Each structure stands twice: as C-alpha cells, then as structure tokens.
RNA sequence: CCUGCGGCACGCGCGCUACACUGACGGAGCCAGCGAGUCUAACCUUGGCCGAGAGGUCUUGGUAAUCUUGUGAAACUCCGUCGUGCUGGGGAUAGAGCAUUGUAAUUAUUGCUCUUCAACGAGGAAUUCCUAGUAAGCGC
C-alpha cells in the first residue's frame, strides 16, 4: 500500500490534520504550497519545524496539512504543532528510531509547544 | 440448575465458578450469621460489621451500605459475578455483548492502569470500576477513533 | 558522517562506553582523538612507528596499540597522552587483548 | 589539520526554500539579520537579567512569564521590549503591529550606527536604570523622601518601560512615528546623551537620591 | 515543467491578469462603471476607475477556476464588506449585484466562464486553459 | 503512624477524614510535615508532625496520586498523577501556588534530585523524562521501552516481545551526586542510566529462576510474578538496594578488583610509589598512589606516613583529590582498628579546607 | 565616581520595614570579605548582583 | 431535618463559595460582587470574562467548592442572582429587585466579616423550607452565642427580603443599625442541577400566567 | 448623544462617541465561536437576473452535523493616498430625493444617496471595574 502516518495539531479552536506519507518532497497546507501562509510575518513560526532539524529530512516524505477553526495566528500555531508531531512519527514508524530521538531532542530545546498541546485549562485561586 | 443458569447469563469459563462464588457468598452470610447471634450493645459487634460493609461496598458486591438486611437477603452470586471484568465491560458500554467481552480479554485488548489483564475472571473494585480502558496502541482503540475521526498516530493510537 | 584526518591506512577506530570520544589509529602514524557529539578534533597525537591494530577497552578508557618497532603502547583516552610502553617483542605483533 | 564531513549532497528541496533562508541555519539571527552572537551586556550586575544568550527569530515567544516571581527575567529582552511598545488603550492586544516596529526599528539604529541594534538595545537598557531611587518614608505625617537602592530587575523593568514611554510621548504630535524616535531613543541612550527621554529622568532619580541620604 | 493557477500567489496573479486583459481591449466593460460604488457598505467609487473592472474580473477568473460553480448572490457575498452603519454597529452587507452579474455575462464573451448544469458560473476548458497560460507568465517572471 | 528509632513507639497515627487507602507517602526534611497520596481519593492529604490533623487536602488531580516527594533544598513537594500532568505544589508561607507540567503517558515513578532543582519520572510508555522545576520546561528524557527484559508467563498467551506488562519502571532514584538513575519495576530488570550523557550503564538481572514466573524470554517447547518494587541509592553509595519478590537485593563496590588509574605517566608503576615512601615525598606517594585508584597501594601509604606530616600533607592535597581521598577515609575506618590513626587524618582534612568543604556543599555528599 | 557592586547573599525575614523596602545583607563582589546591610527597592532574591552608588553607607530601618 | 444534597456536609465542613459576575461587568455591579463577597464568610471574588459556564462549573468541581453565585445586572442596577450547590446540587435563580449597594453610602467603614446569626422568618411552606435549607448552607457552621452581625432572611408578600444588621445590647432594649445591602429578593426557578445544565429536572418555577397565578403564595 | 435616578430651568447614577499619523481614507490579504430557522403555513434563505446603494425580482436548499453556512464577522495584515491644518480628524444639527416594515411612519420606524461639517486639542473636584487567554480592543 501507502505508508502514512497521521498526526494531528491543537490551538486555541483549531485543528490540523496532517497525513505524512513517503513521497517526494513537496509540503502543502490547505491545497497550497507553505510558503503561502497568510499572515506573511509568523512564516517563520511555520518554517520552524522545518529549519530547526534540517531541511533535508523532507526530501522524502510529503505533508498533506488542512486546518479548520481558529483565527489567523492560532492556526499558525497548529501547523506548526503537526508538521512537527508528523515528522517525528514517522520517523518511529517507517524511518529508524535513532531519528526520532534526534528530533524529539531537537524540538524540545526549541519549543516544547511544537510537540505536546499547552492546554491553558483555567486555575481558581 | 442454578449453576448453570447464571454461568450462561454471564458466561463463565468453568461451570464450577458458581459453585466457587457461593461459597464465598455462603460465607458471607455464615459470617453474618454469628455475628447476629452477638448482643446487639457490644462494640466489637457495631464495629465489626460496619468494618465488613466498608470493604463489601468497595469491592461492589452490595448496592448500599446503610440497610443491614441486603447482608443475608441481596449477597447472591449473580451480585458477585456482575462484578467481573467481562460484565463490567459490557455495562461501561465497552463491547457489544457479553461474550464479546471475553473475547478482547482473551485476546488481549483491555487493561486495568498500568498492566494490561488476562483472565476474564478479574474481580474488579467498585474503587478500581474507573480504570479499565482498552489497551493503549490497540487494533481495537484505533477503530473506535478512526470513528470520531480523532486518530493522532503521533500517540500511533 | 565522513571524518577526513588520516592520510594513510586508517588501522582502527574505536569509541568510547559514554559515546563521547572517539580515536583513530593510521599507519602513518597519528593517533586521532575525537569528539562524537561535536564533530570537532580533540587532539592528534603522533607516535613513532605505523600502528598496525587497536584495542580499546571501555571500561576504563584505556587503549593499546601495536607498533611496528616492535612494541606495545598503551594510551589514555582521557588525559590524551602514553602512559605505558611495553618492550620485548622480536617480531610483528599479529593480535593482542586486553583483559 | 583536520575536517569533519557531515553533509554528504548537496540538499536541494522540492519545495524552494530561498537563498536568505538556508543560509539562515547557520546562526540563529533575529529578524534573518541580527546575529546574538557577539553581544555582551557591559554592565555587571545587569547580566542574569537582560537574557541575550538564548538566540531567537523573531520577538514573538508566546510561552508563560506571568507565573513565578522572576520568569519574567528570562523573556529575550527584544520581545520584553516590544511587549511593552503596546500599552495604550489604542495598541492593547495588537503584537504583531509591535514587532513591526521593532524590525522597522532595528533597521533604522542599523543605518544610522552601523555596529548593530542588539548591541544598542542592551546597551540602552544598562544605562537608563537607575543606581539609587528614592522612596517616601512615613515619618508621622510629615513625609520625606528617604533615599535608599534599587534591586536589578527593577533596573530593567522601569529601564524598557522609560525607554518606550520616552519614544510614545515624544512621537505624539510629529510626524515621526513610533518606530523612527523609538530609534532616537536608543541612540542617545546608549551614548547617554542627555538628550534622551530616560538618560534625562533617570538623572532626576539619581540626583534626587543624592541629595537626602 | 507545468504550472497550475495554484503555483501562482495570489494577488501577482489577479495583478498581471488584470493587467492582460486590459492590454486585450476586449472585455466589455458596461456604461456606468465610473459612478458605482462595487458595494453594500461602501462608501466611495473605486480609487483606480481605469483598471478596477478589469481587477475584479481578474479576480473573478481566478475564483471560479478553483471551484467547481459559484453564482451571482455568491460573488456579491464574497465581495461584500462591513458596512458602517455612522453611530450603529457595523454588520455585513453584500456587495453590488449588477456589477458581478455583468462581470459573469462578459467573461463568457471571451469564454472565460460557461453556464455549468446545476446552476452557477464554471470555468471553460478554454479559459482554463488562458489562465494557466499567464501562471506560468507571472511563474516566469524571473527574467 | 510514624515511628521513633529511640524508643520504638508510635508517635500519632495520622488518618484522613472519611477513611482512604494510602498509597505513597513524602516526609518534609524539616519534620513538620508528612503528605500522602491514595487510589480511592485523589487528593494529597497533608499532616502536621505535632498536631495529628490534617493541615490541608491538597487537591487538583485527575485520576490518582502515584507518588509523592519533597526536594529537601527549596522544601518543595512534586505530586504523581495518571492524569498525565505532573503539579509541582508550594505549600509553605503565603504562596499556595502550584505548577502543572503535561506529561505523554501516566507518570507512576517520581524522582526528586538532591540538588532541588530537577525531577525524575517514569512513565508508562517506558520513558524516563527529566524535568526542571523553576521553569517547566525538561532537560532531556532517556528512553527505556527497549532495555527492558521482560518474562513470558506459563499461562502467558503472548510473546514475550509483545506484552505490555513490564516495560515501563515502577521506581527511580537519583544517586545523591546527581548524575545517575537507578529504575526498577514490575520486570526481570534493573538499569542504571547515566543523566548527562543519557545512556545506560549496566543491565542487572534480578534473578533466575524458573520457579518464578517472570524470569524466562522463552519457555521450553499462578506462579509469583518477579518484579522489583522499590530501589534506593544507600548514602554511602557502593551499591543500591533493589527489594525483590525474592527478598532484598544489594549491590555494591566494595570488592575493588577492578583497574580505574586517573592520570598515568609512564614514570607512575606500583614500585615507584613504594620508592617514594624509603624517599620520604609523603605527598607523592599518596598522589602518585591515587593515579593508580588501588585500595592496598593506598592502605600501603595511608598507614605508612607519620603523625607529623599528616597536616604538611593534609594542605599539600589538592581540592580535586579532596572528595575521593574523604571518600577513601570513610569506607577504610569502619573496620579498621585505629581509631586515633583516622581521625587525625579527618581533623586535617577538615582543618585543612574547612570553607572548600562548606562552600561545595553540592560536590561533597556522599563523603559527609 | 567608582561604582562597587554586591552580591546578595540572605534577604532579611520579620524586620518591620515600610512596604515595597526589602532589606538585605549583601556581600561585595570585588572582595568577598565584607558585608553591608542595605536596602533594595525591586523585587529581589538570593545569587543577584546589586549596585552599590556608596559603599560605607549601612541602610537602618525606614519606619 | 436537612435536605438530602447538604445532608453528607451538613454541620461538618465548613462551605467555600464563589461569587463571580456575569460578563464584562459594570463597575457598579462589580462593586456589588463584593458585597456579596462580604455578606458571606468563605468567599471569594472571581471576575468573570471569556470563561464558558462548562469550563467556569467543571473547574470548580474539580477544585472542590460548595456552590456557585453569579449576578446579572440592567445598567448598572444588579438584577438577578442565582446560588448553586456544586456536587450535582440544586440551583436557585433569584431576581432581586430593591437593590441599595453599600458604596453609594458613605466612608462609614468595613463590615464586620465574622461568623453571623441567622434569621429565617415566615417560611412555612414546603418549598419554603427548601429556600431555607439552600440559603443556610451558605454561612460558617455554629457562629458563637454573642458574635455582633446577624443577617436577616425575611419573607413578607413572597418577596424574601434580607438585610444586614449589627446589634449591641443595652441596659434594657437591643439597638440595631443597618450596615450592607438592602435586597428585595425572589426565586423564579429552582433546577436540581447545577446551572450548569440547563436540562436537569425543574423542582419549581415561577409560574406567572395562569388564572390563580397573583392569589397563592409560594406560588 | 444614549440611558437610569432626582427635580421641575436643573441635581445624580449606568453608559456610547471621538478628539486622530499605534490614524483616516482606497484597494487588496482573509481567519472565529455560541447559535436560530417554514405549516397548516410564509421562517432561515444559496443561486440567476434588475438597482450606485437601500432594495426589487425569478427561482432553490433546509422541520436541519444534510440547506442558509466555511455565517469568507470585526478589529487585524499588506500596498497606496493624506501630512499636522478643528486637516482628509469628528459626524451633531439640518435641506432634498430614492427604498423597506406596516391598516397607519406627521412629532423624522428604519435603511440607502447628496449636501450641511457643530462641540470636542485627553477632560476640575470626584470616582468605577480588574491579576492570564484576564484587563482592554473587536465583531457575532
């Protein structure tokens, strides 16, 4: 068949449903290349689960991302979140483990949001 | 019958489980019986039961634990034999029926908090009720999302 | 990864239990130490005589080398320098052990 | 002496990631221009915070400062400076306007002093916070003010907050905006010009405290 | 190695688009189309009344092309804005009918667009076929 | 119910309001309070050592507390939850405020560093993660799904590969330097990771026995389980004691039949340190006796040099040697009979560079 | 006008100091001997460094 | 005889109650909040924006409170209030009409804050006494034989009307003076879910169209 | 100005508007959540067509996770015009015409279109609300 790993992606109201599959290196979002995110100055919030590994570790694989909810920037926050929750599994999956643990440090001295959702669920005091 | 008749409601693996319950459920009531027959102003009496009717109520066999009367009269097999794991997946709505039930336990699907469990024939505590879940990664906890269209193969649930 | 120090035969490479550090034995001589986690030299040290084989024991970053005059020298991993020498061979030395 | 090889091909994407940009993997810069590298804070007792070391793209962190009492110490100074560029009732809740500034404003200290910005930012901010300000005492009815000293992070808190308050108030009526007297800000400031909104209250502040002590 | 109306951005596309279609000459812009207002809640004529008809249709183009049909109350939705109602709250209003149903008549004299079974405005196989012509113009504008 | 040691009594016995189990359980290292943690209630009860109320019933989770502990630097308490999130909770002077971290899988191991500034877990997809507590953030996390032997049962219908009884670590404890981890649970397997450089060290299996069930990967062509239930690192830090379905194990260093030199020259052999001793270079011999790390060339130099230059060579010892010759002292003169030999070695050490010792507090632990 | 600074050592607990005034025993950086108890203003903890405009100064209570 | 949701706490832990306000308050009413946060012992004052009535009750739960008081208000006049018992307890929303807030007064001072008496007059009816035992439980369990604030709940023409009083004793007579607010207060509705719900099982609600509506009382 | 309370020209309380360049205006970029919706009838209404607009009209889907609706909401973003002038900031007061709801619009129901272009240059003494996805901005 095809090999693909789903992941998915959470901000404020927004979901992102990224579908990772071996292929040959082109990486959309919502039928539209990712160098056409809309508010022009958090591309570089999105490029981050690009540039922070290496580009080099998209040569083979595709990301099929669709966003629905949120607004402008707190859907940016969550293809950012599955871009880099589905590069990392599919590297435990149909690439070599010693990868995977390369990424998951290499997010996680970055940002940990891209990885695991910061739910700011309320606290009475 | 009777041995029968509830090994089929609640299908059980050896029809010599029924007999292995009521004779604890007999031993209940034994138990119940003599400490009947102690005067009723005595304070082991009054703390001896109630510290009974705490632990019979946490492991569920026994609806309430104010009425003194279900100790003899509601102690039955069939109450303790709905306290199995295959009945209490079936009454938290986990597989269809009964038997189908047994069958993800057998195979492996089901867990109670850390360890996943084996026999179908786990007693589980009304206290120990909230923690059976399907096993984690599972080819049977992965349908259920795919359902709700909420898989997230970074958990590769 | 591609490491380029010798320019002869490379005769052994090894790495250290914490996956640190990792030496190179050539037959011209060098004795590179490098790092691993960092792709940066440590150091580079040069004996004497070609280096026909390596033993490295990961215990106690102690490693030994064969030369080709005829002796055995034992080098530091840490500390990057010889710490014993062992003469008495009269021919090439084909395999050795650490205990 | 020695190499190590560590790429292998050339890496080439199907997607085209620009020229600027994977060059960018190098250092991390801020805006894509401003290397971190490079910039001390030359006043001690200054560094543990004004928090340069951790490199960032853009002044945007989002994560949570509000919570313990000195988190807030380790914000990368350049978004700590363009989080308090929106404090109007006009400009509250609008970041992005604000990092729009501060990349239009980096630019500008750039072309006039070419060194760099973020050598000036933190340069700023060590010379407009105060050494010693004053505090009224009780003293039965009849107040003084008592001159004692001041703890660092409060040298940085009122140090960003007179720098922008400095550049709010003095592009109020002029056609200069936010971004360019912002800019003429921190200019003087680093030279401490006395020319400059803070370098002048903060010497009110330290002459106050001088003179009843 | 071909290009898809989706390889362009946006705006460089309804941009040279809108730009083509002016140096074509033939488009059919109606009488009025200095006095309109293009909405519900507008307040002024468009700034540029040279090349705002052919900017609009340019835009229109592109958004049929990628969809399958899409109608005249459609277009007045999509290119109606808030109207400010002075000292009320402001609401959405739909944008002016006859402007967008005469940019719909007059792309189907170039066959930009075709009458599709269900209802609607749909894109022809020929200007489906103009329109991926200039994205690769504008891809190629790289000297 | 707590316990004295001098008289073997109970104190008070501190119970909850409506009757709980209690799990686990976290002592303040100022002895003022002791909280615990349930399966029935979820809520951390906490008791005052004086007075046997319950000061408080610290609560927030979901699902229960696994463990509980408290940093004895800044006397801060970290609560366990199946919930995924691990609460650091303040609880002293005014501040009552506590701080959630998420977490992948249930977190049932937790670990509290002497330094008071890191927290170790284990949670149940395997991995060891470890957290700081003054940012929420994590320093790293070290990966034990695949280091982990795991028993097939006899009545097991399973390979032993796939059952997803025993690769998590039902307990972890820090050394007192820091810089290792010690996890146990209910598997055949004991590990000892190295936190900085992130790698395990050596692999211990618990025992083998077929009469226990869950030693054997693969039986031949119910029975007590073997899984270790809780580990600790001794003070005095030769071994750490794992207890067992077996009974309680120890391991330990005090064989040293082992060759671990630290600086060799060519120059430095066995003979030359005995050389040194006819030379009279009392501060060679020793040194050129630790570059070897050889417990009797030690006890040939240590027993050797007088009373007279015990001090002359307490302030000739460099600070680097100063933690592993107090460490040397300690195991050597518990059985040994100077007693008056030792302590002038100790009162020199002490006398030598009392402000070093203090000022390091951190690096001197296990020596203390 | 040499400026000293000073490390904090150990703020000062139950001293009846006017609101918003922490006092604090701060150890001079420049030579580890010396202490001198003076007064912060901001908020402030342990392991920080402070600067002193006048050293011989040794701030008393503010009432 | 309790009812049957206060019946486990009843007399033995002390309630921790929530007074917040309705969204994007007025700063007449959030002055009002406080009063109601000081008319109570053990509450605290939540201000209120951008949280769901879900996730404001199901983070409450969780946290462990007794119950919940929301205000509404017209232009700046507090209308409505509702308390609502949180471990699936009952819910009862008060429309409160003759409001006087305690900061319109003068700098008199600060009110007592001890444990009050209570007075409970003119509740005869079975519905009544719910109204009792739902208001009761909000207030410190055994106040002391001479604490000197008593708040009273009185019931003339179905409009429950409470006051706030402090009293000193003379040589002969009780004199009394009147601190905090002045409610006329009635019940509309009475869920036995929490307000949370919206579904659960109406005990009574204000009918107010039916023939003998005005001739009843509790009614 | 809106509104409540007093008073009977005014006193008080809740509020809305803007004084502008962190703006306005013109294009352009284009992203929410909670919700409601037609039977014995006229509901939510796509789409087409006509009208600068407001609206009109011919049709359609929907008793509804099905059709309206991805409610393409607004602040917001970019590019441009204006240039510190009660200015292009502000839109009160008012003239004239065109629409909509309604048996009925005069004392203007409301909407649209052109003209009229006021006070207001940050608000005395007073005083309200508020600690994190909150305050405030913003639309539904």
């Known amino acids: 068949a095809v090999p693909s790993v789903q992941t998915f992606g959470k901000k404020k109201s927004a979901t992102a449903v990224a579908h990772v599959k071996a292929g040959k290196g082109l990486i959309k979002v919502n039928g539209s290349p990712i160098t056409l995110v809309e508010p022009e100055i958090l591309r570089f919030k999105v490029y981050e689960p690009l540039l922070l590994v290496g580009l080099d570790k998209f040569s083979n694989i595709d990301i099929r991302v669709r966003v629905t909810g949120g607004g402008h920037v707190s859907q940016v926050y969550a293809i950012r979140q599955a871009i880099a929750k589905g590069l990392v599994a599919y590297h435990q999956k149909y690439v070599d483990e010693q990868s995977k643990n390369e990424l998951k440090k290499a997010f996680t001295s970055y940002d940990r949001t891209l990885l695991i959702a910061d739910s700011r669920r309320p606290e009475p005091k | ?157 | 990864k591609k490491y380029k120090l010798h320019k002869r035969a490379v005769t052994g490479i090894s790495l250290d239990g914490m996956n640190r550090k990792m030496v190179s034995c050539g037959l011209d001589g060098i004795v590179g130490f490098y790092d691993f986690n960092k792709s940066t030299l440590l150091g580079k040290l040069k004996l004497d005589a070609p280096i026909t084989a390596m033993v490295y024991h990961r215990s106690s970053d102690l490693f030994a080398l064969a030369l080709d005059d005829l002796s055995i020298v034992v080098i530091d991993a840490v500390t990057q320098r010889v710490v014993r020498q062992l003469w008495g061979h009269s021919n090439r030395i084909t395999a050795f052990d650490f205990s | 002496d020695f190499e190590v090889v560590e790429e292998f091909t050339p890496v080439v994407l199907a997607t085209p990631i620009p020229e600027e940009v994977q060059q960018a993997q190098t250092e991390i810069k801020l805006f894509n221009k401003w290397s971190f590298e490079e910039v001390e804070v030359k006043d001690a007792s200054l560094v543990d915070y004004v928090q340069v070391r951790q490199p960032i793209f853009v002044a945007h962190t989002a994560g949570r400062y509000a919570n313990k009492r000195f988190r807030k110490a380790q914000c990368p100074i350049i978004e700590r400076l363009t989080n308090s560029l929106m404090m109007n009732g006009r400009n509250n809740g609008k970041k992005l306007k604000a990092v729009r500034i501060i990349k239009h404003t980096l630019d500008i200290i750039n072309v006039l002093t070419d060194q760099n910005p973020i050598q000036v930012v933190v340069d700023a901010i060590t010379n407009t916070g105060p050494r010693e300000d004053t505090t009224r005492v009780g003293g039965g009815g009849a107040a003084r003010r008592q001159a004692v000293d001041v703890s660092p992070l409060r040298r940085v808190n009122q140090a960003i907050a007179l720098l922008t308050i400095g550049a709010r108030e003095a592009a109020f009526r002029n056609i200069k905006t936010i971004a360019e007297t912002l800019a003429e800000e921190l200019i003087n400031a680093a030279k401490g010009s006395s020319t400059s909104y803070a370098i002048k209250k903060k010497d009110e502040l330290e002459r106050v405290a001088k003179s009843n002590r | 190695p071909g290009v898809s109306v989706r390889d362009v951005a946006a705006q460089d596309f309804i941009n040279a688009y809108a730009s083509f279609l002016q140096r074509q000459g033939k488009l059919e812009v109606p009488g009025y189309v200095d006095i309109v207002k293009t909405s519900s809640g507008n307040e002024m004529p468009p700034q540029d009344a040279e090349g705002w008809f052919y900017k609009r249709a340019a835009s229109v183009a592109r958004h049929i092309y990628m969809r399958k049909q899409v109608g005249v109350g459609k277009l007045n939705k999509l290119y109606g804005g808030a109207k400010s109602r002075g000292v009320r709250p402001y609401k959405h209003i739909d944008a002016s009918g006859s402007i967008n149903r005469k940019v719909l008549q007059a792309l189907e004299k170039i066959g930009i667009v075709e009458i599709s079974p269900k209802g609607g405005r749909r894109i022809s196989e020929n200007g489906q076929r103009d329109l991926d012509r200039i994205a690769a113009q504008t891809l190629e504008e790289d000297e | 119910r707590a316990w004295d040691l001098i008289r073997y009594r109970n104190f008070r016995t501190f119970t909850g309001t409506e009757r709980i189990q209690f799990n686990c359980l976290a002592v303040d290292p100022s002895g003022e309070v002791v909280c615990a943690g349930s399966l029935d209630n979820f809520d951390i009860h906490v008791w005052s050592v004086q007075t046997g109320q319950l000061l408080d019933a610290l609560s927030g989770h979901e699902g229960p507390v696994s463990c509980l502990s408290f940093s004895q630097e800044n006397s801060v308490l970290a609560s366990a939850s199946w919930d995924k999130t691990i609460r650091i909770w303040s609880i002293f002077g005014r501040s009552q405020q506590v701080e959630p971290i998420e977490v992948y899988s249930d977190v049932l191991a937790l670990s509290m560093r002497p330094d008071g500034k890191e927290v170790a877990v284990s949670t149940l997809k395997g991995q060891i993660s470890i957290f700081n507590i003054e940012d929420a953030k994590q320093v790293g996390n070290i990966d034990c799904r695949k280091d982990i032997i795991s028993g097939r049962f006899n009545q097991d219908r399973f390979t032993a590969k796939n059952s997803e009884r025993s690769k998590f670590f039902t307990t972890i404890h820090y050394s007192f330097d820091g810089m290792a981890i010690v996890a146990g649970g209910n598997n055949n397997s004991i590990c000892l990771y190295d936190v900085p450089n992130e790698v395990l060290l050596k692999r211990f299996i618990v025992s083998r026995n077929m009469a226990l069930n869950g030693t054997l990967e693969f039986l031949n062509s119910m029975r007590p389980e073997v899984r270790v239930t809780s580990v600790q690192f001794s003070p005095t830090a030769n071994a750490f004691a794992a207890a067992s379905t077996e009974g309680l194990l120890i391991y330990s260093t005090n064989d040293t039949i082992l060759f671990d030199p630290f600086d060799l020259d060519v120059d430095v052999t066995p003979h030359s340190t005995v050389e040194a001793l006819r030379e009279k270079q009392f501060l060679n011999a020793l040194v050129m006796a630790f570059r070897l790390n050889e417990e009797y060339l030690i006890n040939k130099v240590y027993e050797a040099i007088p009373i007279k230059e015990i001090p002359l060579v307490a302030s000739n010892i460099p600070a680097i040697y100063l933690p592993r010759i107090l460490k040397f002292i300690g195991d050597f003169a518990i059985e040994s009979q100077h007693i008056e030999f030792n302590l002038i070695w100790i009162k020199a050490l002490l006398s030598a560079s009392g402000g070093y010792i203090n000022e390091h507090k951190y690096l001197f632990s296990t020596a203390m | 006008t040499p400026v000293t600074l000073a490390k904090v050592i150990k703020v000062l607990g139950r001293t009846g100091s006017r609101g918003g005034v922490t006092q604090v025993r701060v150890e001079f950086l420049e030579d580890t001997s010396r202490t001198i108890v003076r007064n912060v203003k901001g908020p402030v903890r342990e392991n920080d460094i402070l600067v002193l405009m006048e050293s011989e100064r040794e701030a008393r209570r503010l009432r | 005889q309790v009812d049957d949701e206060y019946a486990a706490t009843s007399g033995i832990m002390d309630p921790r109650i929530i007074v917040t306000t309705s969204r994007d308050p007025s700063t007449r009413l959030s002055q009002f909040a406080k009063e109601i946060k000081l008319l109570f012992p053990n509450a605290v004052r939540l201000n209120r924006g951008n949280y769901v009535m879900p996730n404001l009750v199901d983070a409450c739960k969780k946290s462990g409170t007794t119950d919940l008081v929301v205000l509404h208000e017209h232009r700046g006049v507090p209308t409505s209030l509702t308390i609502s018992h949180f471990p699936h307890g009952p819910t009862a929303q008060f429309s409160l009409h003759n409001v006087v807030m305690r900061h319109d007064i003068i700098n008199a001072g600060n009110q007592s804050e001890v444990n009050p008496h209570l007075i409970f007059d003119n509740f005869t009816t079975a519905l009544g006494k719910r109204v009792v035992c739902i208001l009761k439980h909000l207030f410190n369990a055994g106040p002391k034989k001479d604490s000197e604030r008593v708040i009273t709940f009185a019931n003339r023409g179905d409009f429950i009307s409470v006051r706030q009083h402090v009293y000193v004793r003379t040589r002969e007579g009780v004199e009394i003076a009147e601190v905090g607010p002045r409610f006329e207060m009635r019940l509309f509705e009475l869920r036995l879910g929490t307000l949370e719900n919206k579904d659960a099982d109406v005990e009574w609600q204000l009918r107010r169209f039916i023939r003998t509506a005005n001739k009843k009382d509790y009614l």
């Open chain 2, 1 to 157: 019958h009777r041995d029968t008749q509830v090994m089929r409601t609640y299908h059980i693996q050896n029809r010599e489980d029924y007999h292995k319950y009521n004779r604890i459920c007999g031993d209940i009531r034994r138990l119940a019986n003599k400490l009947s027959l102690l005067p009723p102003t005595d304070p082991f009496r009054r703390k001896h039961e109630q510290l009974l009717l705490d632990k019979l109520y946490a492991m569920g066999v026994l609806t309430t634990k104010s009425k003194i009367s279900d100790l003899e009269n509601k102690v039955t097999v069939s109450a303790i034999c709905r306290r199995r794991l295959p009945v209490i997946m079936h009454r938290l709505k986990m597989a269809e029926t009964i038997q189908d039930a047994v069958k993800f336990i057998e195979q492996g699907h089901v867990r109670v908090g850390p360890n996943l469990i084996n026999d179908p024939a786990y007693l589980v505590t009304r206290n120990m009720e909230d923690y059976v879940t399907w096993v984690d990664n599972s080819k049977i906890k992965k349908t259920l999302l795919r359902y709700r269209n909420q898989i997230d193969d970074f958990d590769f649930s």
